[PDB]
Amino acid sequence: NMAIIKEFMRFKVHVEGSVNGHEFEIEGEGKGRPYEGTQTAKLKVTKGGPLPFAWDILSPQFSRAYVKHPADIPDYWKLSFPEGFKWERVMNFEDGGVVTVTQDSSLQDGEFIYKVKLRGTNFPSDGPVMQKKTMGWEASTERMYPEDGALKGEIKQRLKLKDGGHYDAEVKTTYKAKKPVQLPGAYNVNIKLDITSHNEDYTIVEQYERSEGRHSTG
Protein backbone atom coordinates (compact mmCIF):
# COMPACT_ATOMS: atom_id res chain seq x y z
CA ASN A 1 0.00 0.00 0.00
CA MET A 2 2.99 2.33 0.14
CA ALA A 3 2.77 2.18 -3.68
CA ILE A 4 -0.74 3.67 -3.78
CA ILE A 5 -0.75 5.77 -0.60
CA LYS A 6 1.97 8.18 -1.63
CA GLU A 7 3.85 10.59 0.60
CA PHE A 8 1.84 13.48 -0.87
CA MET A 9 -1.89 12.91 -1.56
CA ARG A 10 -4.87 15.11 -2.42
CA PHE A 11 -8.52 14.63 -1.52
CA LYS A 12 -11.96 15.90 -2.42
CA VAL A 13 -14.89 16.07 0.01
CA HIS A 14 -18.63 16.47 -0.34
CA VAL A 15 -20.88 17.00 2.68
CA GLU A 16 -24.68 16.94 2.80
CA GLY A 17 -26.27 17.74 6.10
CA SER A 18 -28.72 19.50 8.27
CA VAL A 19 -28.43 21.13 11.70
CA ASN A 20 -31.65 21.86 13.61
CA GLY A 21 -33.38 21.37 10.26
CA HIS A 22 -31.20 23.81 8.32
CA GLU A 23 -30.03 22.02 5.18
CA PHE A 24 -26.65 22.62 3.56
CA GLU A 25 -23.94 21.24 1.34
CA ILE A 26 -20.18 21.72 1.35
CA GLU A 27 -17.61 20.94 -1.32
CA GLY A 28 -13.92 21.07 -0.63
CA GLU A 29 -10.51 19.80 -1.45
CA GLY A 30 -7.34 19.25 0.46
CA LYS A 31 -3.86 17.85 0.44
CA GLY A 32 -1.33 16.50 2.87
CA ARG A 33 1.41 14.06 3.82
CA PRO A 34 -0.28 10.85 4.95
CA TYR A 35 2.76 9.40 6.75
CA GLU A 36 3.58 12.68 8.49
CA GLY A 37 0.02 13.08 9.83
CA THR A 38 -0.50 16.55 8.38
CA GLN A 39 -3.04 17.98 5.98
CA THR A 40 -4.86 21.11 4.90
CA ALA A 41 -8.29 21.65 3.45
CA LYS A 42 -10.28 24.44 1.83
CA LEU A 43 -14.05 24.12 2.16
CA LYS A 44 -16.84 26.02 0.42
CA VAL A 45 -20.51 26.12 1.43
CA THR A 46 -22.32 25.35 -1.82
CA LYS A 47 -25.94 25.22 -0.56
CA GLY A 48 -27.64 26.69 2.49
CA GLY A 49 -25.15 29.47 3.18
CA PRO A 50 -24.51 31.38 5.23
CA LEU A 51 -24.83 28.70 7.90
CA PRO A 52 -26.78 29.83 11.00
CA PHE A 53 -24.62 27.73 13.36
CA ALA A 54 -21.01 27.24 14.42
CA TRP A 55 -18.64 25.93 11.77
CA ASP A 56 -16.79 24.11 14.51
CA ILE A 57 -19.37 21.27 14.73
CA LEU A 58 -18.60 20.47 11.07
CA SER A 59 -14.82 20.73 11.06
CA PRO A 60 -14.11 17.25 12.60
CA GLN A 61 -16.10 15.57 9.84
CA PHE A 62 -13.33 16.27 7.36
CA SER A 63 -9.80 12.64 6.95
CA ARG A 64 -8.41 9.46 8.34
CA ALA A 65 -5.91 8.53 5.62
CA TYR A 66 -3.55 11.16 7.10
CA VAL A 67 -2.72 9.77 10.57
CA LYS A 68 0.99 9.24 11.33
CA HIS A 69 1.63 5.81 12.91
CA PRO A 70 4.67 4.17 14.48
CA ALA A 71 5.93 1.29 12.31
CA ASP A 72 4.67 -1.25 14.83
CA ILE A 73 1.06 -0.04 14.95
CA PRO A 74 -0.86 -1.11 11.84
CA ASP A 75 -2.50 1.89 10.14
CA TYR A 76 -6.01 0.52 9.67
CA TRP A 77 -7.09 3.38 7.41
CA LYS A 78 -4.13 3.20 5.03
CA LEU A 79 -4.24 -0.61 4.88
CA SER A 80 -7.88 -0.51 3.79
CA PHE A 81 -6.95 0.91 0.37
CA PRO A 82 -7.46 0.53 -2.56
CA GLU A 83 -11.04 -0.19 -1.45
CA GLY A 84 -11.15 2.20 1.50
CA PHE A 85 -13.27 2.43 4.59
CA LYS A 86 -16.44 3.86 6.10
CA TRP A 87 -17.21 5.37 9.47
CA GLU A 88 -20.17 6.31 11.63
CA ARG A 89 -19.96 8.79 14.47
CA VAL A 90 -22.11 10.08 17.30
CA MET A 91 -21.29 13.35 19.12
CA ASN A 92 -23.23 14.10 22.32
CA PHE A 93 -22.79 17.73 23.39
CA GLU A 94 -23.24 18.65 27.02
CA ASP A 95 -26.39 20.79 26.45
CA GLY A 96 -28.20 18.03 24.60
CA GLY A 97 -27.12 18.80 21.03
CA VAL A 98 -26.42 15.70 18.97
CA VAL A 99 -24.50 15.21 15.72
CA THR A 100 -24.56 11.92 13.89
CA VAL A 101 -22.36 11.35 10.85
CA THR A 102 -21.74 8.69 8.24
CA GLN A 103 -18.77 8.78 5.91
CA ASP A 104 -17.34 6.91 2.97
CA SER A 105 -13.66 7.13 1.99
CA SER A 106 -12.43 5.81 -1.35
CA LEU A 107 -9.43 6.29 -3.64
CA GLN A 108 -10.23 7.28 -7.24
CA ASP A 109 -7.85 8.49 -9.90
CA GLY A 110 -5.08 8.80 -7.32
CA GLU A 111 -7.00 11.08 -4.92
CA PHE A 112 -9.03 10.30 -1.83
CA ILE A 113 -12.76 10.87 -2.20
CA TYR A 114 -14.77 11.60 0.95
CA LYS A 115 -18.56 11.61 1.12
CA VAL A 116 -20.12 12.80 4.39
CA LYS A 117 -23.73 12.85 5.56
CA LEU A 118 -24.50 14.69 8.81
CA ARG A 119 -27.52 15.28 11.03
CA GLY A 120 -27.34 17.73 13.91
CA THR A 121 -30.35 18.04 16.20
CA ASN A 122 -31.59 19.43 19.49
CA PHE A 123 -29.14 22.32 19.79
CA PRO A 124 -30.66 24.97 22.10
CA SER A 125 -31.58 28.11 20.15
CA ASP A 126 -29.69 30.24 22.67
CA GLY A 127 -26.71 27.87 22.99
CA PRO A 128 -23.16 28.40 21.71
CA VAL A 129 -23.68 26.40 18.49
CA MET A 130 -26.74 28.23 17.20
CA GLN A 131 -25.39 31.57 18.44
CA LYS A 132 -21.91 31.02 16.94
CA LYS A 133 -20.07 31.46 20.26
CA THR A 134 -17.38 28.85 19.70
CA MET A 135 -13.70 29.42 18.97
CA GLY A 136 -12.14 26.16 17.84
CA TRP A 137 -11.34 22.77 19.30
CA GLU A 138 -8.75 22.11 21.95
CA ALA A 139 -6.29 19.34 20.99
CA SER A 140 -7.84 15.91 21.60
CA THR A 141 -6.86 12.31 22.20
CA GLU A 142 -8.95 9.62 20.55
CA ARG A 143 -8.73 6.30 22.40
CA MET A 144 -8.73 3.54 19.81
CA TYR A 145 -9.62 -0.11 20.33
CA PRO A 146 -10.73 -3.05 18.19
CA GLU A 147 -14.24 -4.47 18.77
CA ASP A 148 -16.57 -6.69 16.77
CA GLY A 149 -14.29 -6.73 13.74
CA ALA A 150 -14.13 -2.92 13.51
CA LEU A 151 -11.96 -0.14 14.95
CA LYS A 152 -13.59 2.10 17.56
CA GLY A 153 -12.47 5.50 18.79
CA GLU A 154 -13.69 7.49 21.79
CA ILE A 155 -13.01 11.18 22.44
CA LYS A 156 -13.74 13.69 25.16
CA GLN A 157 -13.63 16.73 22.86
CA ARG A 158 -13.66 20.36 24.04
CA LEU A 159 -14.78 23.45 22.10
CA LYS A 160 -13.44 26.84 23.36
CA LEU A 161 -16.09 29.46 24.03
CA LYS A 162 -16.00 33.17 23.18
CA ASP A 163 -16.69 34.32 26.71
CA GLY A 164 -14.41 31.79 28.36
CA GLY A 165 -14.32 28.12 29.26
CA HIS A 166 -15.36 25.17 27.16
CA TYR A 167 -18.29 23.34 25.63
CA ASP A 168 -17.85 19.59 25.81
CA ALA A 169 -18.76 16.69 23.55
CA GLU A 170 -18.48 12.94 24.04
CA VAL A 171 -17.72 11.29 20.70
CA LYS A 172 -17.70 7.68 19.57
CA THR A 173 -16.81 6.51 16.07
CA THR A 174 -16.74 3.10 14.41
CA TYR A 175 -14.35 2.77 11.47
CA LYS A 176 -14.78 -0.23 9.16
CA ALA A 177 -12.52 -1.24 6.26
CA LYS A 178 -14.32 -2.38 3.12
CA LYS A 179 -12.15 -5.56 3.05
CA PRO A 180 -10.51 -7.59 5.83
CA VAL A 181 -7.64 -5.62 7.34
CA GLN A 182 -5.42 -6.30 10.36
CA LEU A 183 -6.88 -4.53 13.41
CA PRO A 184 -4.51 -2.75 15.80
CA GLY A 185 -4.64 -3.19 19.54
CA ALA A 186 -5.56 -0.29 21.80
CA TYR A 187 -3.62 2.95 21.19
CA ASN A 188 -4.14 6.72 21.08
CA VAL A 189 -4.52 9.19 18.24
CA ASN A 190 -3.60 12.76 19.16
CA ILE A 191 -5.40 15.31 17.00
CA LYS A 192 -5.21 19.07 16.67
CA LEU A 193 -7.44 20.81 14.11
CA ASP A 194 -7.00 24.54 13.45
CA ILE A 195 -9.13 26.93 11.43
CA THR A 196 -6.36 28.79 9.63
CA SER A 197 -8.56 31.30 7.77
CA HIS A 198 -12.18 31.98 6.99
CA ASN A 199 -14.28 34.69 5.40
CA GLU A 200 -16.69 36.69 7.49
CA ASP A 201 -19.72 34.41 7.19
CA TYR A 202 -17.78 31.11 7.18
CA THR A 203 -18.84 30.23 3.68
CA ILE A 204 -15.15 29.77 2.76
CA VAL A 205 -12.93 28.13 5.36
CA GLU A 206 -9.40 26.70 5.50
CA GLN A 207 -8.24 24.07 8.00
CA TYR A 208 -5.01 22.44 9.09
CA GLU A 209 -4.96 19.17 10.99
CA ARG A 210 -2.22 17.13 12.63
CA SER A 211 -3.05 13.55 13.68
CA GLU A 212 -0.58 11.13 15.23
CA GLY A 213 -0.95 7.65 16.62
CA ARG A 214 0.98 6.84 19.77
CA HIS A 215 1.38 3.70 21.84
CA SER A 216 -0.73 3.75 25.01
CA THR A 217 1.03 0.63 26.43
CA GLY A 218 4.61 -0.69 26.12
Helix, coil or strand: residue 207: strand
**91 close to 183: Cβ distance less than 8 angstroms:** no
- What is the Cα gyration radius of the chain? 17
Residues 111 and 30: their CA atoms lie apart, in Å, by 10
Q: Solved by what technique?
A: X-ray
Establish how many alpha carbons lie within 13 A of residue 11's alpha carbon, considering only the half-sphere containing its beta carbon: 29
CA–CA distance from 137 to each of 23, 95, 105, 162, 209 (Å)?
Answer: 23, 17, 23, 12, 11
- Using CA atoms, how far residue 178 sits from 79, 87, 146, 156, 161, in Å, is 10, 10, 16, 27, 38
Question: Is omega for the bond preceding 82 within 30 degrees of 0, making it cis?
Answer: yes
CA-angle at 86, arms to 17 and 77, nearest 5°: 130
Q: Classify residue 97 as left (phi > 0), alpha (psi -120 to 50) or beta.
A: beta
Give 147's contacts (C-beta < 8 A, 6+ positions apart): none
Reported structure resolution in angstroms: 1.1
Taken in order of first residue, the domains within the chain and their CATH numbers are 1-218 (2.40.155.10)
Round to whole Å and give the CA distance between 114 and 121: 23
